[PDB]
Point group: D2
Chain length 344, copies 4
C-alpha cells in the first residue's frame, strides 16, 4: 500500500442514525413522498414531480430559509405539483474545487468528513421534519447508508449511469431513482440502467455498522430517465417523442423527467425559464409522459466563487448558477397552471 498515505476513523452510520433519528414527522414525510412519487410513476396520479433547489448546499442556514419558502409553495400547489427539495451536497467535477458539504463542510480543504456527515444528516432531518421531502444524489456506495432513509427520491450521478456498481446500488434503494441520459443525448445507457436496477442483485456493501457484508436486493421498479441534454438541449416535443418511442421499444413506461438546467439550458441559469415555457406548453397541450422536472434554484440567483480570507453572499450558489426565488415562484406557478390545463 505505497499509494495509501493515511487511514482515519469514520463514524459508523448507526452513530449518525442514533444522534439524528427521524422524528415521526420526518419519517411520515419520507413515507408519504415516496408513495406519491410511486403513484405518479405508475400513472395513477397526474400531478407533476418537481425536484427543485440549489445546485449544492454549502450553508444550512440558507437551506432552511429556502426550505421554509419552498414548503409554503408546496402546500399551495399540492393539487398540481409534488414538490421535493433538492438537497445535494457536492457538485462532481473533474476540474478542481470545493468537494462539497460532506467532504469539506468548513469550505477550507480540511476534509472534515465526520463533521460533514453530521451537518448533512441534521439538515435532511430538519427539512423532512418540517414537512418538506428531500431529493438526493448518489455518487458513491458508502454515503447513502447515512442519509438515504431521509431521501424521498434520488438521482444517480450522470457519470455513473453505465456503472454496474451504481446500478446495483439503485436496485436496493428504498426511494425512486432517476438515471440521466448520455452526454451526447442518447438514452441507451439510461435504459440499460433502468433495466439493470429493476433486477435483484447480490454484491458487497458497507452496513449500518461500518462493516462490509454481502447484500441481496429486490430490484427497484421506480427508476426512470432524466433528460438532461446532449450536445444540444433535448427538452423539446420532438426529443420527448423520440425518447417515448425508445422507452416503448424497450418495454418500459414511456415517461421522462426533464432537467431544465445545464446542457438543457445551455449553462445560463436564466434559460431554465425558457425551458419551463416550452415544457409548460407540452404539458398544457396534453403531454402525460412528462412526469417530472428538475430545477436549480436558490434564494439569490447567479453564483459566486469560494475565496480564501473572504465572507460569502448569503443564499447564493458557490457551484453552478441558479435561478433566484422570484423566478422560482413564477416557474412553480407556471408548471402548476400547465398541469391544470392538461386535466380538464
Amino acid at each position: 500500500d505505497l499509494r495509501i498515505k493515511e487511514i482515519k476513523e469514520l463514524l459508523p452510520p448507526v452513530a449518525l442514525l442514533e444522534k439524528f433519528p427521524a422524528t415521526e414527522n420526518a419519517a411520515n414525510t419520507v413515507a408519504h413522498a415516496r408513495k406519491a412519487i410511486h403513484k405518479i410513476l405508475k400513472g395513477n396520479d397526474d400531478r407533476l414531480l418537481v425536484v427543485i433547489g440549489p445546485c449544492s448546499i454549502h450553508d444550512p442556514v440558507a437551506a432552511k430559509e429556502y426550505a421554509t419558502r419552498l414548503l409554503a409553495l408546496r402546500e399551495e400547489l399540492k393539487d398540481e405539483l409534488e414538490i421535493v427539495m433538492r438537497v445535494y451536497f457536492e457538485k462532481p467535477r473533474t476540474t478542481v474545487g470545493w468537494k462539497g458539504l460532506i467532504n469539506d463542510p468548513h469550505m477550507d480543504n480540511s476534509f472534515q468528513i465526520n463533521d460533514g456527515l453530521r451537518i448533512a444528516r441534521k439538515l435532511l432531518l430538519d427539512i423532512n421534519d418540517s414537512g418538506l421531502p428531500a431529493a438526493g444524489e448518489f455518487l458513491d456506495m458508502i454515503t447513502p447508508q447515512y442519509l438515504a432513509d431521509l431521501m424521498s427520491w434520488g438521482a444517480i450521478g450522470a457519470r455513473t449511469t453505465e456503472s454496474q456498481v451504481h446500478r446495483e446500488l439503485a436496485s436496493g434503494l428504498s426511494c425512486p431513482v432517476g438515471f440521466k441520459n448520455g452526454t451526447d443525448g442518447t438514452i441507451k445507457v439510461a435504459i440499460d440502467a433502468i433495466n439493470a436496477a429493476g433486477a435483484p442483485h447480490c454484491f458487497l456493501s458497507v452496513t449500518k455498522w461500518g462493516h462490509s457484508a454481502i447484500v441481496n436486493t429486490s430490484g427497484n421498479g421506480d427508476c426512470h430517465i432524466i433528460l438532461r441534454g446532449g450536445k444540444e438541449p433535448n427538452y423539446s416535443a420532438k426529443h420527448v417523442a423520440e425518447v417515448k418511442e425508445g422507452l416503448n421499444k424497450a418495454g418500459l413506461p414511456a415517461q421522462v423527467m426533464i432537467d431544465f438546467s445545464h446542457a438543457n439550458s445551455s449553462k445560463q441559469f436564466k434559460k431554465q425559464m425558457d425551458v419551463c415555457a416550452d415544457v409548460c406548453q407540452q404539458i398544457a397541450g396534453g403531454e402525460k409522459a412528462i412526469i417530472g422536472v428538475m430545477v436549480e434554484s436558490h434564494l439569490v440567483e447567479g453564483n459566486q466563487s469560494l475565496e480564501s480570507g473572504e465572507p460569502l453572499a448569503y443564499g447564493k450558489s458557490i457551484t453552478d448558477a441558479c435561478i433566484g426565488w422570484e423566478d422560482t415562484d413564477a416557474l412553480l406557478r407556471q408548471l402548476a397552471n400547465a398541469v391544470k390545463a392538461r386535466r380538464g
Copy 2:
C-alpha cells in the same frame, strides 16, 4: 429503511484471506518485477511491449492453471520482446444483467457464494504468481480489491466505469499501474480525465483490510495510461493512434497507448483480433513507439458458450484459441524486433 434490501450475510474481511493465502516469496517477486517492468515501459526506458492476454473471464481454476503454464512458457521464450501478463479477470461488468464473474458467483448457479469466490480467486492468483506468471485484472468492485491487489501486477478500469469518480479514486491508490478503457461510444476524453484524476491525491470513503469503513488518503498514481478498445467503430488504426497521441500531448500526458484487440475493436468477433494484430503489428514494425502494450482475449479453445460446460471455452465473450494465441504472440514479438 432497507425495504429493497432482502438479506445481509457475513463477509470474511481481507485480513482472513491474506492470512489464509499469504504471498509466497516467489509470488511477491513476480509482482514486484512485473510492476517495475511496466513502470519502465511506461517511463519510455524499455522498448518491449506489455502484453495483457488471457481469458475474458476466469470460471474454472484448473483450465486457468493449464493456460498459465502454457502462457508461462511463451512469456519466457519471448522475454526480450514482450512483457507477458495473463488476464485473470474475476469481475465482469454486464450491459444490463448476467453472470458477474467468479468472485460474485463461483458456482455459476446464482448461489452467490462470495466467501468461496474470494478464497478460490485468491488461491488461483497466488498459484499463478507463484509459478512466475504475473497477472492482470479489472477493478470493478469497490470492496474486493483489498482481497487481491497485492497479487496484481496491472489493473484496468473498464470502459463503463472510466468515468466513475470512485474508480478514479481507487486507481489513485493502487500499487500497480492502471489502464483506463475509452468510452463505449469511443470517447477518448473520459479516459484522459481519468488519467489526470488518478495521478492526483484523493480523500474518500473506503473499506480497510479489517472490513471496516474508513477515510482513506491516496498518493496518486502516475503509472496510468489509456486503452483503445473501440466505440461505434474500431479505433486501433494509425489515424486513431495519431489522434489519441495529439490528445495526450494537448493534455500534457505522455503520448502512449495500449490497444485492446478485442471487444469493439474486433466487433465482438474473436477472429478479427488476428486481423487487428496484423494491423497493429504493421504500426509497430514501422517505428510506432507510442504503442506500449496490447490486450487480447485468449483461451485454450476458441469461441464461447452459454451458461455442464465445455472445457477451455469462455462463458463470456468469445476468445481466440491457443493455436491462434501462440501465433499472435509470435507476430507481436517479431514486430517488436523490427521496431528496434
Copy 3:
C-alpha cells in the same frame, strides 16, 4: 457454539457518545471531581470522599429525584465532604439474579441491552450535567467505553478484585479506582490489585468502535482499598490499624475507604448508621487514614422483590436494602461534623 443460543447486534460506544455527548457542565463535573479525589489521595485535602446512593439504579425518575436531594447536600457540606452519587448500572450476583439496568432495563429478562445503554448514558449525563458527580462498579469488560467519561470514581467489586482483566481495566481508567477487599475479608488481594493497577499493561480490549484491539495502559496511581467486611465486619479501629500497616508494608500510602454496607453491616441496612457512628468517632478523634466512605442509600428505606410480580414501589431498592432519605441526611451531616472536628 452449541451453548451459544443467539447473537445480536450491539450499538458501538461511538453511537452512544454521539447521541449523548457530555455538555460543558457535565465534563466540568467529571474533571473537578476526579481532581478533588486525586488531591485527597495524594494527602493534600483533608475532606472526606463520600460515595453514596442506591445499591442499584432501576428507575431514572427516582434516580434524578435522589440526585437533586444529594446535590443540595453536596453543595451545603462541600467544605467537609466531596459527595459522589452511586450510579450503579451493573450488579454482581452470588449465583443468578437481575444484573442491573444495562443488562436488563425492563427487569423482565428481555435483556434489551441497547435500550439499557441508552437509558444509562442519558441518566449519567443528566446527573453530571446537574452538577453531581457519579460513581460506578466496573464489572463488565465491554460497557466501560460507553460510560467511563462520565464516571468520577469507580469500584472493582469484592468478587473481581483478584481478577487480572479487572486490574488491567483499572490500569487504563481515567478515574480513581477503589478495590474492595475479598468476600471472606482478605486484605492482601486488594493490596495486590492496587499494585497491579498502578503498573502499565498490554491486553485485549474493545475500542470505541466496537472492535477488539490490543491496548496498552499507563497504569493508574489513583487506586486505594475499600473495606467492606468479611466473615465479620472490618470497619473498626483494630482493623483499620491492621490495613494501614499492611499498606505501608507493601509501600502504599496508609489510606482506606470504608463501605458501611454489605459485609460491614452484616447486610442489615439500618446498621450502616452504627458503622457511621463508629467511623465518625474515628475521624473526629484524628484518624487521617480514612479518606472515604461508601453508603447504600435511597429515597425510601428497605428493599422489595422483583420476583413477586407486584408493581414496584417508588424510590425503593430492588437489590440490597438501603437507608432512606431521612437517615441519609442525618448520616451526611454526621460525617461532615466528624471531618470538621478532625480538622479542628
Copy 4:
C-alpha cells in the same frame, strides 16, 4: 478521556486465525470424542478417570509436540482406565507481574506480539488435536477463547476468577466441560456458586469471531465440576473429599471432584505423594474422584527466564513439574487404581 490509554494496535479477528488454521477432520473428531467422553464420566456412565496432564505453561512448541507425542503413547495404552488430555496452558496467572506467556510474549522479551502468539498457539493446538491428543486450556480472558476454544476438550477457570460473574458467564457458553478451582481458604462455596451460575443461561456482551462486540445468549453449561487445589492447606485427603461431597449433595449438585496434585496441594515431587494418596482412595472404591490434574514436563523442575542464560529444553519456565519418568509411573498408578475400583 483516554489519559491512561497509551496505544491501540490492530488485532487479527478470530475468523482470520480460523481461516489460516482450520480444524482438520482428525482435530475435530479428537475434540468431539474427548468432550463426549468427559460428559459420560461427569454423568456417571463411564468409570474411567479424566487425566489433564502436562506443562504448567507452554513456552516452546517444539518441546510441547515431543511431550504430546510421548503422552499420546500413554493415552492409547491406558485408554480403558484413563481419558488422558494434555495440559496446553499458554501462561501462568501471576500474583501481580512476570513473563506473560506464549500468546502475550511468544518471543519472551516483552515485545507483546499478540498476533504472533495467537497464530503460534492456534497452530500448536491444531497440530496436537490432529495427532489424536485432546487438549485442555485455562480460560483467563473473554477474548482469547474465540480464537482457540474450538480446539479445546476441557477448560479450567482460574482460581482468582472462580468468583467472577464475567467468567461464570463465559463458562455458561463454552462448548467444552469446565472445572472451577476452590478458593484458597480451601473452601468450596464460591466454586459451588460458579457451577450453579454457569449452569444457567446468561445474556451478556462478548466479542464475536468477526472481532466485533455483540449481545450473546447462552444455554448454560451442565458439564461443570469442582477442582480441589488446596489453600493454606492441602485438600486432597478422603476426609476433605467427603466434606466436599456432602457440600455438593447439600447444594443439589453431583458429588464428584477433580483433584489437582500440584500448587497448594503441593514441591513438584510431592505431586507423586498426592498420586499415592489419591490412588488409595480410588482403589478402595472412591467413585467421586472423576479426574485429576498434574503438572508435568519432559524434564523435571523449572528454571528462570530472567537470568540471561539459554534455557534448557523441555523444562518449565514457570512452576516446577515432574519429569517424564515420574509421569509414566503416575499414569500407570492411576490406571491401576481405576482397575482396582472397577473389578
